[PDB]
Amino acid sequence: MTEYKLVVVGACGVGKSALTIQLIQNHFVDEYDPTIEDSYRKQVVIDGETCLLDILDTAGQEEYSAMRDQYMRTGEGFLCVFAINNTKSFEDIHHYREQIKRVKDSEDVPMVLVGNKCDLPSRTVDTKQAQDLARSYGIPFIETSAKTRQGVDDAFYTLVREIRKHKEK
């Protein structure tokens, strides 16, 4: 069956692990070690296609930088996550965008921008500012809550759809 290799990136604490675990296991994890990096696989149906999602939940620095370059080169699409109550996490998106493009040496890399923690009252990044950034990149923007599951399937399935559009060219 078709496999899609997805990589979830973003600053520490934005909800990469909580988003991934909601997708895979359908529960919200309140506490998951910020230093754990692991991969998960799940069979899903997207637009009638039975496929396997192979998802790497990243944790930042690696023992050796070659390990970062390896997952960036093999990954087919990237979920770039910030938290709507953490402006620094939003600013860091610029760094992830640039680094992934540089490792892959490509200007066309399937990516989706995710603003997580949308259930929280505290917000420092309004939707408009994130829409403006996504428009500048030419990629979709989705607001999510790993707690309530709002937008979770959409974020991952939209990324698969972006990979499909890239592959058909």
Ligand X SMILES: Nc1nc2c(ncn2[C@@H]2O[C@H](COP(=O)(O)OP(=O)(O)O)[C@@H](O)[C@H]2O)c(=O)[nH]1
Our CB check for Mg ion shows the closer of 36 and 45 to be 36
Which of the ranges 9-17, 68-76, 98-106, 155-163 carries the binding residues for Mg ion, by CB under 5 A?
A: 9-17
Our CB check for ligand X shows the closer of 97 and 147 to be 147
Which of the ranges 7-15, 37-45, 62-70, 155-163 carries the binding residues for ligand X, by CB under 6 A?
A: 7-15
Site for ligand X in 122-161 (CB under 6 A): 145-147
Residue 119 sits in the site that holds ligand X (CB under 6 A): yes
Burial of residue 128 (number of CB atoms within 10 Å: 0-12, 13-18, 19+) = exposed
Residue 116 interacts, among ligand X, Mg ion, none and using kind-specific CB cut-offs from 5 to 8 Å, with: ligand X
C-alpha span between 134 and 140 (Å, rounded): 6
Site for ligand X in 34-63 (CB under 6 A): 34
Residue 152 interacts, among Mg ion, ligand X, none and using kind-specific CB cut-offs from 5 to 8 Å, with: none
C-alpha span between 98 and 3 (Å, rounded): 25
Residue 18 sits in the site that holds ligand X (CB under 6 A): yes
Locate 149 and state its tokens: 């599951």
Q: Which of 6, 15, 17, 56 binds Mg ion (CB under 5 A)?
A: 17
117: left (phi > 0), else alpha (psi -120 to 50), else beta?
left
Can you count the helices (H) and strands (E) in the chain?
Answer: 6, 6
Residue 58 sits in the site that holds Mg ion (CB under 5 A): no
SS in 3 state form for 8-19?
Answer: EECCCCCCHHHH
C-alpha span between 135 and 47 (Å, rounded): 25
Q: Which residues of the chain form contacts with ligand X (CB under 6 A)?
A: 10, 12-18, 30-32, 34, 116-117, 119-120, 145-147
